[PDB]
Subunit: 122 residues, 2 copies
Amino acid sequence: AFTVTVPKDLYVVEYGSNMTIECKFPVQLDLAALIVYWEMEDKNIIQFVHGEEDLKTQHSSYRQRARLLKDQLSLGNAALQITDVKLQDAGVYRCMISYGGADYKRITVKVNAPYAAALHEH
Amino acid sequence: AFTVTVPKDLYVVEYGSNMTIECKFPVQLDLAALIVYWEMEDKNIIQFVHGEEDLKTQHSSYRQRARLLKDQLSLGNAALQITDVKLQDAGVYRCMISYGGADYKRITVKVNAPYAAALHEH
């Protein structure tokens, strides 16, 4: 059965940093058979369908900050890079991968920030 | 955990008939959070992403014959209707559903046909 794995399911990062969170899936890669869908608490981050990124329902809090590392896909690695991490990025992410089957995993992200930074986003 | 279920995982149909095969997923439905991806033995049938059907990598053997019944989605039912069933439609279908998680199921389809009909497609 198709299984998605997460070697690391807890990330603790500082606000303003860049972070790359990863889900592994078994793989030469056939982009025509692949869907990668990253989401966090009902906010869509990445929809990648047959080699094309669809931003149509990406949540505005992630606009211009979220990237799927496409070169990693050929390694069986769905790697989501978030730049300039916000307080609002803390939470549980789900990677939903379809590739001859479908599975998902949950990744917890914590963001540390001083009071003034958390107040910026309050 | 998000689970996709198949009440019926074996369909036996006659060539030239219409058949509707179904996968259930737990659900008001948020089309913005949903992906339905139907495939059969490396042939893409349906990709339905945030309420829009993407035919870009649909396999040519299913062109004009495959429909996702959208009204069933609000019931937690991914229903794939194949019209004018061909011999080539026999095989194992996978429904890969992403909706706050992701899961899949396998459905076996057998197609009965007389010799002349199988010869048409040989």
